[PDB]
Symmetry: D2
Subunit: 493 residues, 4 copies
């Protein structure tokens, strides 16, 4: 049926009148200013990502205010995402400043703090105390973004390892280190993470991109760290290693969403398997009805070039085909030369891919996996999307305050736009990581509570008409679920 | 049910015991020697491509002779492919002489460059003449015209090549991705081999390893349902000709582990019109039997290889073993995915009208490769006067 | 999946908590008195049939008056049906006067005798006039012409009666069985009530018990999917008027225990064309919801009863409760299977545009009959400006 | 889909060119002669049933020889069926000859043998020793074909019961008695049964209609009784009471087929439930792939009348609709006035019903109930019938010696005739209780073994052409299974 859909397609037929997939942009010096951010919003940005691995609270404070200003001036809602620093293993200091590692040379990595400030080419410090327990002779240690690769030969003692330098590379003070294949038992949240998350709650961020998640128990740690005030902030778990992939089922259940970080995964898992892992994680989230983000090596060559490679274009397209809600941009928007052109092009690719995509395969697949009997919530939303296909309805209107109904509806993948009408601006922002949904804020303060709902309903249809999704004579499937639910098949005037 | 299949998958489970996708290699300075060609075959080459845009007849004669020698010393059959220069007319004067050479040297298939319409395929057929009627024409789609007339082109030709790079010159890259989907799916329906070509693992021509984007490209080509993936510069002039073929084989095997063949089987079966003619019904039913009984191999008796291609069309989730009386067929089935050919010498072994000798040879091959053991089911199909056997392995 | 359903069944399991099929009784000397009519209602009568082939207006006036009194004293709604003499013209001079009487006395439905074509239904409509436009015409198929023109007849009429005895006069009995299958299935598709009539439990008119063949006849009529079964002599002039209605109710309930409503639901849904109009989509989806969530009752807000009939068409495996503002509808829905009507007095209780009062009345009725308790699901549907609610019962 | 099939039907379109259902006739004085039997064969009889409740070995010897003679003279194969007497509870003798039971009178049924020969209206004998154990006050005892109904009031002692006569009826010496609802523990086979079965084997009967089967263990008793010589004779279990219905699953598995005796069932189970029980037993046998016979009250009024009641006509038709292989005639052929006209009419009804029947519903239903993976036998036959629907094949040819493949193929219900080619005349006869199959005997003695099979295959196609099922240009699905199997889709010349 995806096969069958391909036969009817023509590459010369006009694209769809809406883009379902959502674009996340990492903010950096190339895009932090208000006018640069207004550029990105018009280019197709829905979520602004702050990378808390770099820059101070003052720096990310600027981002928060500029993102809020740029959004207000354009009268749109943009989500703010906090990407945590997470746990990190780093080397110590070197005398004096660096150390040049010759290929074939023997060196000693020690876990003893007495060498934290007197590292040399021959012996230097690594700050993770259990390093000796988790690493075995034959294993590899990556240092400085995986540029320096060295192989562990033997245990010199319970604190130091004998290594051989595979790579000629000069390393500086306090470089990050990777332990491919090893079971790292660092805390879920670091001491710095607790501070940054605290800040996130105080500044009212919409979501946390929680780094290096390995088990379900770690998701609770992030929740505890966010505290009672932050109980409504979405936790999106970043899967970065084998543990995260292995524990994916329990992690998905505890998280509000997932991020597939292909680059971090590519460190210790062969790239061919990372492609397959992507399919797995995206499909699992689709069934769960939780947002999924395809992140990392998207249009990276377009950081310095006006156009990407062809293989990169198919990578972005196939992310949509896999069923990803979101596609992410890192250095392309943060430090790149073409921050607007890369977001505009990613939008074009997502829309082109969507035109080829058969949403009915998604609907049918996700429907068949529901056990009988279904519960009310599941039944209503699945049936609503069913009605859309049944009647060739050209829009949907979902009344959801928290965004739960909207996410559940989007889960079943209609072939029409989903308009969500919410009384909460927080929900307008948070739904930006759910594909195929657009938010309309209904001001319950200066417009009333509207228990009759038909003000909120007409507000949704008004939005659908203005965007050109529906006209007179068209069908629109309206749904309000909360379990006080209802489904209306409406004729548009 | 690809979505349902993705859920059950684990990337830490062992890979499949066979690769279904096929690999085509472009021969060049880096790989023309007998020893280099033995390296390629062991790495996973099924088809040798000669690029006639460059080199003389004497140069490509070396390739033809070396490939046949490298193959003989390894006891395997390798397909030899002629890729015409092309341009404007379909066949040029240069092409007419080149195709003349191909017939005389007995090449297995033609990669016809820059094919834009259905009658242009006939010009290539005309140039081959009566002696080369058994040579396959694989049309290369390189422009908007080829994409537009694709329905008629597929009907006239024996297969398609999706040249993404050439199509990219004029069509925006994002649309070339979709065009790949269409071209491959149409070819699957027709039951004719489709080749994904150009810009495959290009960075690995001078680098020890390719980019991640390039890896996903190869994988998704297999996911789209391509019979073949093709290497151009990577084997012709590259620094790592053996490693790039071994890596592509690894990617194809990994992708195949993730691929749900049942979706392919079911999609193609549903598009068949009732009533089905004998050949379609026999073949779809036999593939169905495999799924029905969890059979671990198939045996197809096919002389011309028509039966083998039609069975392959329905995508079993087990290896297909084709027992053929012709070596020509053995080489030609190297562009059809999920098939492995076994030569049965009708000269020094007999005609075998009872067919039990040919069948026994197929089962023996499936046993020797470790596809089926005692107690396993194996669907046998002969359809020249057809028959279907579900055989229990002793 | 009726075959699959038969496997799971046990004849020692308790019967279903409701009967879906409806029973129509012919009033006669044996049953005209108020007390006899109360006996019939308690035994399972939903519809009273007056046979106008015999008796005077004064005689049938007694029936009309007695039925309404017997029904009032039991607080139930009973449908009054006029069965015309018939013959040749559709409506005769006698029929024109009889139908005149029916309108003036406000009968609920007409059983139009010997209907052969679609325009003949219009003659019955003509005879009813503007005052009787809300009276249902159920055409009686009694000959080969009626069977032949059945498609147009069903389209014009509000329902069908399969008169097996009358059809038997000319058509061989074995073909009348098949004709019953066709007529009933066509009516199910149209979503219009179908009545199985004549030769039902005929031996039980003078005998205390019927033959086994007669029992299977009644059961299979329910299996074919008839809304109603009808008693003629058995109640009009019989020795055991109460026992025969109680026994038919028992048979219908037993058959319904064996019947797989999902087969009916699925067969009718598949015959719908995509795209569906709102009404069809709303109703099929609501019945689907019941199966999807194992809901134990349905509530339909319907004034004219169009919604109730359309929901009933899709055959839920749970009771349907129709909340109507009109008593006319309550009586008229007595020929639609699986439906029970609740009267909502719009005069002394309000218009209820919010609909929550009408809905609460339906749930209350489903509670009082023991269909749903706390924790059970109940699909509510209003479709005059439509809406669908899956309500959890408190 | 049966619903959908009904819409396309027209009662004026010509009937099918073959009848699938099979007709069983009970032989009696009305049909025992050779010419009367030749009458029945031409009328549509496939199986001759002997009722061993009545008539001596000499009487049934006559039937066997006359049935064999009548079949030979017409060059057709007819099955001979032995319907066993089975266990029976009877009263004792009365002085002198009878006893008149007044309605409302009190009488005493005793199990004490001393009253076997001096029964009166007041006290008389019943020969079943455990009668006191199985019957409780309030229960009913039926005597003389259920004409005499009396209600047990109390236990007079451990040997006699106090009863009240509900029915005015005069009863004769040694009348049969029923115990509705009671768990009768009489032996599976009686002493007389063992003698009659012995005779059956010696005379080479094809099948046993084993009376009053209550459990699976009883089926083994009949098998043991039939002995090593009779190991190939089919055992068809007669379900006559609640126990048989309750144990149906295990009984079906041990038997070669089932008979639904609606009359015997109607004794203790209300008729409405007997209709439902019929649906259950027929569908269970269809899944099992074992023949099922609808027996008893078929066209009974046609025993004395030239035509049956309309309700009887729909009864016979609905037996076919239920999915019964066979319909049976008892007194209609044994003692009736119109033995030819009743078989001819039953044939007309079966053929008319079949014309309305959608075999594809049967195929699909039985296919969906097969678990994955299927075994070879199941896979081949299901797939063969699939090919028939797939190609609109107009015939099937099955090479089966025992008839196993033929039964398995027929199980899946093709919409075309099934021609079975067997080297065994025993199989030709036995397949007469399997619907939609016709047998061709291939003489392996005077025609060879034919390992190439294509002689047997061409013999089948020859038969299919002669009956007019296939002509030139038609498809025919050929199958040989044994697990040396094969499937050919053949073009007819
Ligand atoms: C300077 C250097 C030394 C080495 C050794 C290497 S290495 O050898 O390749 O690794 C690379 C670089 N290059 C840079 C380093 C820092 C830079 N700014 C920066 C950063 C990156 C982080 C933080 C935290 C802060 S701070 O917190 O505000 O102080 C600041 C100011 C920048 C650059 C650029 O090259 C650059 C080029 C064009 C435009 C802008 C920048 C740029 O901003
Ligand atoms: C402007 C520029 C141009 C060039 C060419 C280069 S060069 O190429 O390195 O020389 C560097 C820069 N400068 C930066 C580049 C990246 C930065 N963030 C960052 C980092 C360090 C790593 C990753 C992995 C990612 S991510 O993957 O995209 O999330 C991100 C966003 C930052 C800066 C800053 O200047 C800066 C100044 C003050 C505070 C914070 C930052 C800052 O955070
Ligand atoms: C005679 C009698 C007494 C009573 C009391 C009653 S009752 O009151 O209604 O029960 C009924 C009857 N009626 C019959 C009884 C026996 C009959 N033959 C017969 C039987 C039935 C079994 C056996 C074993 C043997 S034997 O083994 O060969 O001896 C024979 C000869 C017959 C009849 C007929 O009426 C009849 C009518 C027309 C044609 C043929 C017969 C007929 O053959
Ligand atoms: C010829 C006739 C006409 C009339 C009218 C009548 S009447 O109606 O009773 O008076 C009786 C008869 N005679 C018979 C009737 C039935 C018979 N078998 C039988 C029985 C006794 C019960 C049931 C239940 C069934 S069954 O259900 O059909 O299997 C059957 C076959 C038999 C006879 C014999 O004469 C006869 C003679 C010698 C040996 C054996 C029999 C014999 O077995
Ligand atoms: K980070
Ligand atoms: K689309
Ligand atoms: K070329
Ligand atoms: K696979
Ligand atoms: K009448
Ligand atoms: K039911
Ligand atoms: K018997
Ligand atoms: K038929």
């Amino acid at each position: 049926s995806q096969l069958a859909h391909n036969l009817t397609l023509s590459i010369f037929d006009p694209v769809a009148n809406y883009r379902a997939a959502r674009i996340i942009c990492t903010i950096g010096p190339s895009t932090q200013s208000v006018e640069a951010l207004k550029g990105l919003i018009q280019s197709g940005m829905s979520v602004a990502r702050m990378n808390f691995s770099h820059g101070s609270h003052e720096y990310h404070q600027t981002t928060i205010n500029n993102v809020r200003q740029a959004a207000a001036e354009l009268g749109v809602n943009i989500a703010i995402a906090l990407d945590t620093k997470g746990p990190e293993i780093r080397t110590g200091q070197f005398v004096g400043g660096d150390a040049v590692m010759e290929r074939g040379a023997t060196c000693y990595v020690t876990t003893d703090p007495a060498f934290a400030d007197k590292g040399t080419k021959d012996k230097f410090y690594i700050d993770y105390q259990n390093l000796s327990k988790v690493v075995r002779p034959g294993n590899y240690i990556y240092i400085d973004d995986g540029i320096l690769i060295l192989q562990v030969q033997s245990h010199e003692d319970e604190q130091t390892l004998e290594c051989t330098v595979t790579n000629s590379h000069t390393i500086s003070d306090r470089r990050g280190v990777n332990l491919p294949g090893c079971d790292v038992d660092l805390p879920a949240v670091s001491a710095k993470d607790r501070v940054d998350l605290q800040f996130g709650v105080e500044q009212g961020v919409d979501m946390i991109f929680a780094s290096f998640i390995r088990s379900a128990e770690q998701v609770g740690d992030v929740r505890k760290a966010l505290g009672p005030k932050g109980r409504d902030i979405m936790i999106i778990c970043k899967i970065e290693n084998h543990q995260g992939v292995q524990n994916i089922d329990s992690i998905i259940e505890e998280s509000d969403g997932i991020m597939v970080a292909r680059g971090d995964l590519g460190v210790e898992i062969p790239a061919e398997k990372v492609v397959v892992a992507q399919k797995i994680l995206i499909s699992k989230c689709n069934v769960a009805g939780k947002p999924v983000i395809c992140a990392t090596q998207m249009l990276e060559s377009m950081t310095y070039n006006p156009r990407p490679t062809r293989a990169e274009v198919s990578d972005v397209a196939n992310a949509v085909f896999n069923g990803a809600d979101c596609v992410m941009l890192s250095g392309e928007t943060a430090k790149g030369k073409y921050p607007n052109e890369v977001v505009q092009y990613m939008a074009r690719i997502c829309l082109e891919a969507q035109s080829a995509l058969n949403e009915y395969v998604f609907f049918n697949s996700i429907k068949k996996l529901q056990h009988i009997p279904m519960s009310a919530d599941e039944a209503v939303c699945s049936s609503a999307v069913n009605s859309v296909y049944e009647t060739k309805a050209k829009a949907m209107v979902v009344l959801s305050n928290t965004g739960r109904s909207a996410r559940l509806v989007a889960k079943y993948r209609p072939n029409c736009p989903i308009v969500c009408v919410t009384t909460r601006l927080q929900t307008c922002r948070q739904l930006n990581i759910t594909q195929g949904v657009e938010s309309v804020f209904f001001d319950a303060d200066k417009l009333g509570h509207d228990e009759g709902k038909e003000h909120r309903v007409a507000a949704g249809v008004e939005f659908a008409k203005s965007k050109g999704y529906v006209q007179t004579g068209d069908y629109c499937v309206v749904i309000h679920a909360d379990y006080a639910n209802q489904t209306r098949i409406l004729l548009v005037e």
